Amino acid sequence: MRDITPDLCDKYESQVTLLNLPLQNFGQRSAFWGEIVTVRCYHDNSKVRDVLSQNGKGKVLVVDGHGSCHKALMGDQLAILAIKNDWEGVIIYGAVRDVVAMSEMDLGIKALGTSPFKTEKRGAGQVNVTLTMQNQIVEPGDYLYADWNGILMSETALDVAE
Numbered sequence: 001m002r003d004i005t006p007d008l009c010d011k012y013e014s015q016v017t018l019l020n021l022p023l024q025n026f027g028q029r030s031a032f033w034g035e036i037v038t039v040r041c042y043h044d045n046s047k048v049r050d051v052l053s054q055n056g057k058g059k060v061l062v063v064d065g066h067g068s069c070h071k072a073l074m075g076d077q078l079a080i081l082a083i084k085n086d087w088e089g090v091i092i093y094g095a096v097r098d099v100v101a102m103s104e105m106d107l108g109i110k111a112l113g114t115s116p117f118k119t120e121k122r123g124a125g126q127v128n129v130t131l132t133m134q135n136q137i138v139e140p141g142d143y144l145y146a147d148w149n150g151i152l153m154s155e156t157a158l159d160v161a162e
Contacts, residue, residue, distance in 0.1 A: 004031045004160055005149045016152040021134055023110040026099050031147035032089030032108025033160060034060040038140040040126040042066050045073045047125030052078055056087030060144050064131040065094025069113040072097035083107050089146065093133045108146060
C-alpha cells in the first residue's frame, strides 16, 4: 500500500490538523480514511461492538478508552465484525489484543498498546460524542486520514490519490 498523508498535507495544508497520539500500527492495511464515528468508554467495549455491527463503509471508528491499557477494547472477533461491515479502520486510545491475528487482517488498526485481558460488557459507553484525548478534540462527522506517517483530521472530505 502507499503513503497518503504527505500528499494530503502538501495539497490541503490549510484544511488539515494533525492528531498527535502515540499509537502503534496493528492491521494489515497501513493506510485508512473516512468519516469519524466516535465511542467513549472505560473498561467496557459494549459500544465498540454495537457500532462495529453498523455499516462502516467510508468510516473510521475512533475509541476513547481513556488511554487505559489494562484491558483490550478490541480483539480478533470484533475486528472480524468490523471487516464484515466494511469499516475502513479503527483507532483505539487504549489497548487491543490478538495482535498476530490482526497483522493479517484487512482493516486499518492503530492503538496505544496491548492487553491480553478482555472487558466485562455492561452496556456502558457513549456514541458519537465529542472526544478529548491528550488534550486534543476529535469530532464525530469530521474526516480522518491515517497512515504510518501520522493521522490528519479535516472538516470536509479530501481527495485521496489512489
